Amino acid sequence: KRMRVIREKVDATKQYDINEAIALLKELATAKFVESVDVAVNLGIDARKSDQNVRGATVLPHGTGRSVRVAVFTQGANAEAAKAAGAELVGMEDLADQIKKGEMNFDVVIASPDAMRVVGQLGQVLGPRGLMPNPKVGTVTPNVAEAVKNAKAGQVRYRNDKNGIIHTTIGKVDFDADKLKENLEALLVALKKAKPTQAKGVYIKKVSISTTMGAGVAVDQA
RNA sequence: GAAGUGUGGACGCCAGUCUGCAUGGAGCCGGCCUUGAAAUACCACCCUUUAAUGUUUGAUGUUCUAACCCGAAUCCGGGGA
């Protein structure tokens, strides 16, 4: 398999460093278009417990302003307030089907509390990409009209799901070695600071810099 | 972390791919990637179950063996956990 040429390049036993990772990373992205790299690390926290969850944002290395395509989901009169607001895409719970069909043409998604449980059920697709509206993120609130306006002000959110560890998009392979590593470190630093107090033991059991699809490489967070 | 392929095998009973095996045609990865009766890619949740192996451990049945009981002066014999 083309893995043959991708395996001889990576050593599953060896734990490469940050700088080294990015280097080997580029040659592992030999494919079509510009590949997007991600960073997955193992967290040692009690899943179920809410106080164990880790969520936040890190100032990584473009794409804010009138260009950003907002998608609001409200109910009742809140729909009109969103339209006159300036939201490109507006609608109720009915538009929760089209997105499910394959429509993803949008950058940010705003919505109201009354329609959070219904959207939550369909948060398995927007959850990983950090497109799921949230209170702290200032994405969910009655005054949606103000939300969309306050937008275009400038964050890569990170969370968890139902399968294992945690990750986030670091950048693309086209980027230089210095740039990429410059991001990997920033993300790790923003993660260790998000470590819950109750969490005991090794927070990051194992770090691994791997693109969307490209020979997973384990690295040292330090 | 060579198996994928198209006709090739196993230790507890049923299928998708994995390794030191052996090779051709099936194309180099790929298979993969728009057929009704044979159909899609990424990090806690009912499985998270089941199946197998090693260690610790609970109950039952068998054999053997030191306590105990009886016979005998003793040796020892009979019975027997």
Curated annotation (Swiss-Prot):
Quaternary data: Part of the 50S ribosomal subunit. Cross-links to the P and E site tRNAs.
Sorted UniProt keywords: Repressor, Ribonucleoprotein, Ribosomal protein, RNA-binding, rRNA-binding, Translation regulation, tRNA-binding
Family: Belongs to the universal ribosomal protein uL1 family.
Pfam families according to UniProt: Ribosomal_L1
Originating gene: rplA
Reported function: One of the primary rRNA binding proteins, it binds very close to the 3'-end of the 23S rRNA. Forms part of the L1 stalk. It is often not seen in high-resolution crystal structures, but can be seen in cryo_EM and 3D reconstruction models. These indicate that the distal end of the stalk moves by approximately 20 angstroms. This stalk movement is thought to be coupled to movement of deacylated tRNA into and out of the E site, and thus to participate in tRNA translocation. Contacts the P and E site tRNAs.
GO biological process: cytoplasmic translation; negative regulation of translational initiation; ribosomal large subunit assembly
Entries under NCBIfam families matching the protein: rplA_bact (TIGR01169)
UniProt key word Ribosomal protein: yes
Protein name per the record: Large ribosomal subunit protein uL1
